[PDB]
Design a protein around this ligand. Structure first.
Ligand SMILES: *N[C@@H](CCCCO)C(=O)O
Length: 231
C-alpha cells in the first residue's frame, strides 16, 4: 500500500451532513504528497451556506497522507490498508454543546484517493458557538496519539481539538476515533505513536460559493530512542 503514495495523489472528499434541520453537502478536491505529509484541499458547500463553522469539519474532511519517517515505516496502518481502504468512525463532542457522529470510507478509486463521509449532528444549542458561527476562522496544531486495536484489527485515537472562539475563549472538541480495514488483506498494526498536525485555513478570492482552503502537514513521530543512540 505504501507504494501508492510515493508521488502526488489526487484527492476527492464528499460529505453528506445533517445538523439542526439543515441538510448540507460538501465536495472537496486537491492532492496529497505523503513524502512531505502535505495536503492541499479546497472544500465547497454545494447546497448553499455551511450550517456549522468550517473549522469544526477540518478533522472530518485522510491520514494515509501522513509522513511516516523511515524508522517508523512499520507503524503506518493507514497506507497498509490501501488500496481497498479503511473505515474511519468518530464521535466529536463539543464541550457544553452537541456532537457530531461521522462514518467515512477512505479508499482508492483508480488513481484518486476518495474520502466519503456521512455526518449527523446531535443536540446543538441554537445560540451556541457552533450553530451561532462564533468560531474564529483559524486552526491550531495538535498531536494525535494512535494506538492499536488488535482485536478489531485496526487502530484508535482520542484527542481534544482546540477551537478559538470570537469571545477569546477556547472550545474543546473531544474526538474519539476508530479505524478498521475494509479489505481482508493483512494490515500493519502500529506501536503507540502520534501524528503531529498543523493546518492553515484560507479563502479563494475568486470563489463565490461558501468554501474553505486547507493547507495541512502531518508527520508521524514519537519513536526516538533508537535513532537518538546513533548520535
Ligand atoms: N550519540 C551519542 C549517544 C547518545 C546518548 C543517548 O543514546 C554518542 O554517540 O555518544
Amino acid at each position: 500500500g505504501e507504494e501508492l503514495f510515493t508521488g502526488v495523489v489526487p484527492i476527492l472528499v464528499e460529505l453528506d451532513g445533517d445538523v439542526n434541520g439543515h441538510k448540507f453537502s460538501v465536495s472537496g478536491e486537491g492532492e496529497g504528497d505523503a513524502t512531505y505529509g502535505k495536503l492541499t484541499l479546497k472544500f465547497i458547500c454545494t447546497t448553499g451556506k455551511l450550517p456549522v463553522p468550517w473549522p469544526t469539519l477540518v478533522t472530518t474532511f485522510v491520514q494515509c497522507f501522513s509522513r511516516y519517517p523511515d524508522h517508523m515505516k512499520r507503524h503506518d496502518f493507514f497506507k497498509s490498508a490501501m488500496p481497498e481502504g479503511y473505515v474511519q468512525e468518530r464521535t466529536i463532542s463539543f464541550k457544553d454543546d452537541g456532537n457530531y457522529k461521522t462514518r467515512a470510507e477512505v479508499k482508492f478509486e483508480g488513481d484518486t484517493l476518495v474520502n466519503r463521509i456521512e455526518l449527523k449532528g446531535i443536540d446543538f444549542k441554537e445560540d451556541g458557538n457552533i450553530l451561532g458561527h462564533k468560531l474564529e476562522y483559524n486552526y491550531n496544531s495538535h498531536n494525535v496519539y494512535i494506538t492499536a486495536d488488535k482485536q478489531k484489527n485496526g487502530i484508535k485515537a482520542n484527542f481534544k481539538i482546540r477551537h478559538n472562539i470570537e469571545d477569546g475563549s477556547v472550545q474543546l472538541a473531544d474526538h474519539y476515533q476508530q479505524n478498521t480495514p475494509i479489505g481482508d488483506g493483512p494490515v500493519l498494526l502500529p506501536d503507540n505513536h502520534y501524528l503531529s498536525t498543523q493546518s492553515k485555513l484560507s479563502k479563494d478570492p475568486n470563489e463565490k460559493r461558501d468554501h474553505m482552503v486547507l493547507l495541512e502537514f502531518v508527520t508521524a513521530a514519537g519513536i526516538t530512542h533508537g535513532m537518538d543512540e546513533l548520535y
